[PDB]
Amino acid sequence: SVPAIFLDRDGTINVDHGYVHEIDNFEFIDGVIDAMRELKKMGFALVVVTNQSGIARGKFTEAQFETLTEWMDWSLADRDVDLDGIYYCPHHPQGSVEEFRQVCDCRKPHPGMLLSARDYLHIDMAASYMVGDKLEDMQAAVAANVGTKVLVRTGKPITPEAENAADWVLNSLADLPQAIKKQ
Ligand SMILES: [Mg+2]
Ligand SMILES: [Zn+2]
């Protein structure tokens, strides 16, 4: 029913400084808020799908993630970017925090989060995009039938394996609207 842009968070929306969990260490990457507003204007739903194993690691709590996520959601809404959904996976099989220690269906490369978003927001997966900086993001997208897999260079220098699983490689999410328009 609606096309969406699925978005990784660290390395794609914010600079990945290391288990980011505080407002004062959350830096939006150049041009992404403007690009996101334009993607909403084009008609795309926007959905964040982020692995946050820092929670399972005990680096920060689900409460602190919630606080930072609320701050981010407000900051975007206030600049006219209303996110359609925000999904996150706090688990890790070796988690030190018992509550979050498990294999799950939501940890990318597993496509769980994308499937839930799909069912909840009625998303046309074939008309959608996944944007992220890691192999795991592109593997979750292929499992979820996302039409275009986009890798960005704003986080981790990509690996050849992440490149192989992607359809496009862009410098940044900032460049996605133009890249889509040229289609
Ligand atoms: Mg990332
Ligand atoms: Zn999970």
Swiss-Prot record:
Provide the catalytic activity annotation. D-glycero-beta-D-manno-heptose 1,7-bisphosphate + H2O = D-glycero-beta-D-manno-heptose 1-phosphate + phosphate
* Record-linked InterPro entries: HAD-like_sf, HAD-SF_hydro_IIIA, HAD_sf, Heptose_bisP_phosphatase, Histidinol-phos
One Pfam family recorded for the sequence: Hydrolase_like
Q: What EC number(s) does its UniProt record assign? A: 3.1.3.82
Q: Where in the cell is it found?
A: Cytoplasm
Q: Does the keyword Oxidoreductase apply?
A: no
Instruction: Tell me the Gene Ontology biological-process terms attached to this UniProt entry.
Output: ADP-L-glycero-beta-D-manno-heptose biosynthetic process; lipopolysaccharide core region biosynthetic process
Q: In which pathway does it act?
A: Nucleotide-sugar biosynthesis; ADP-L-glycero-beta-D-manno-heptose biosynthesis; ADP-L-glycero-beta-D-manno-heptose from D-glycero-beta-D-manno-heptose 7-phosphate: step 2/4; Bacterial outer membrane biogenesis; LPS core biosynthesis
Q: Name one GO cellular component term.
A: cytosol
Q: How does it assemble?
A: Monomer.
Q: Of which family is this protein a member? A: Belongs to the GmhB family.
Quote the protein name from its UniProt record. Answer: D-glycero-beta-D-manno-heptose-1,7-bisphosphate 7-phosphatase
Q: What is the lineage of its organism?
A: Bacteria, Pseudomonadati, Pseudomonadota, Gammaproteobacteria, Enterobacterales
Q: Which gene encodes it?
A: gmhB
